[PDB]
Amino acid sequence: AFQGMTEYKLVVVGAGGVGKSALTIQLIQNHFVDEYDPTIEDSYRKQVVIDGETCLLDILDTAGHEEYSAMRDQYMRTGEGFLCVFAINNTKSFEDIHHYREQIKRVKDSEDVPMVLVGNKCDLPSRTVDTKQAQDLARSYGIPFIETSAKTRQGVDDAFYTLVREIRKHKE
Template sequence: MASHPYQQYPQQHLQHPQHLQHPKHQPAVPISITICGDGGCGKSSITLRLVRSQWTSEYDPTIEDSYSVTRRIDGTTYHLSLTDTAGQEEYRGMWASSNLGADAFLLVYDITSRDSLDALQYFDDLIDMEAETRLDNAERARRAGVNPGRANTGSGSGSKTVPPVKIVAGNKCDLQESRQVSAALGLEWARKRGCGFMETSARLEVNIEETFALIVRRVVERRRLAEMGVLDNTEMNARGMTKPLTPLPADSESEKRAPGLRGPNLDGDHRVGRGQGGFWKKLRCW
């Protein structure tokens, strides 16, 4: 039987460190991830869900917070360094000067705000400029007889040789009644810019672990391509791009009101949440 286009990542590949025995001769592979997007779209909520399994309804604007977490994915242990950045416009000059050295970027928008999706263009443009700088570094390394994949040792902007991975996350997918950005529109925006795509809910813990597993897999693949000598960013994006979805959730009543969902789960309805119901399974993994 063919797999469902919205099939969830196998949970055995998303193991938490407390359930693992790490061989001493296999140190964790470091991956740095910067989380960016407009203010109030849920960047901190996504980060804290992953790191502490916590969620809060209080909005406290972030200037910049750093976290680290270990995950074992596809048989390998990874040390994820996460930077949760400011989304407010007054802090964007600071963002551009200090957050472009990451291996991957998670661009977060709020599905109830079209403006938050449009705001991602600012970050995407900066990331693409950083990608071009890294490709230039890779070409110089190649001419010097150094494998670009192995020369990717710097930690800051301008010192790396592997272009960063970009994943777009449409957050707050539990707020179907207030949706302004359809899943199809979010996916189209992401694909046009060479990004992977997910919809998430930090509140109901939908696609949090899966999104970061996707990021790790894309970073690993991009590093592998760099070691093979693939230096074209367009080709890298094409090889790692989200596959087309058939079918996508439609802009219909079925998308706006999920089966079993009575508002944003405020009335204690336990039928809706992680691992529950056909609708949420469809949101699992794009």
């Protein structure tokens, strides 16, 4: 017997200042946060319909640099899917992606963890990471790549919905 909607536990990771919170707040509140208030840990929920199925997204917005690795391991174990976010004007955030990805694979003991690579701030003019390089990296991981802007809303729904679709594929 159906006891209520399917729930998906999504975790947003990536370097400090890439726009993890801004992405999440744009999804939840349709609001662009212009201030940079560094996150410790925040949890959000939203019910959405994706491919005809109603679901409850439970979204954990994480800190760029996480002071306890015990707390990091805990959300990595609990998370069913991960948005790995870099900023397209910050080369270092892009180079950091491989470390977030390795950390997640180690904790989950798997090569095939649902993830989406997200290149955020695509509205800004000062691009330093080429779309082709990000696509190549994503292809090497076997995951989707989506360019986003928390400010214009480009790709924001798509990033979260795509991650849910990755989780569903992995669940069969």
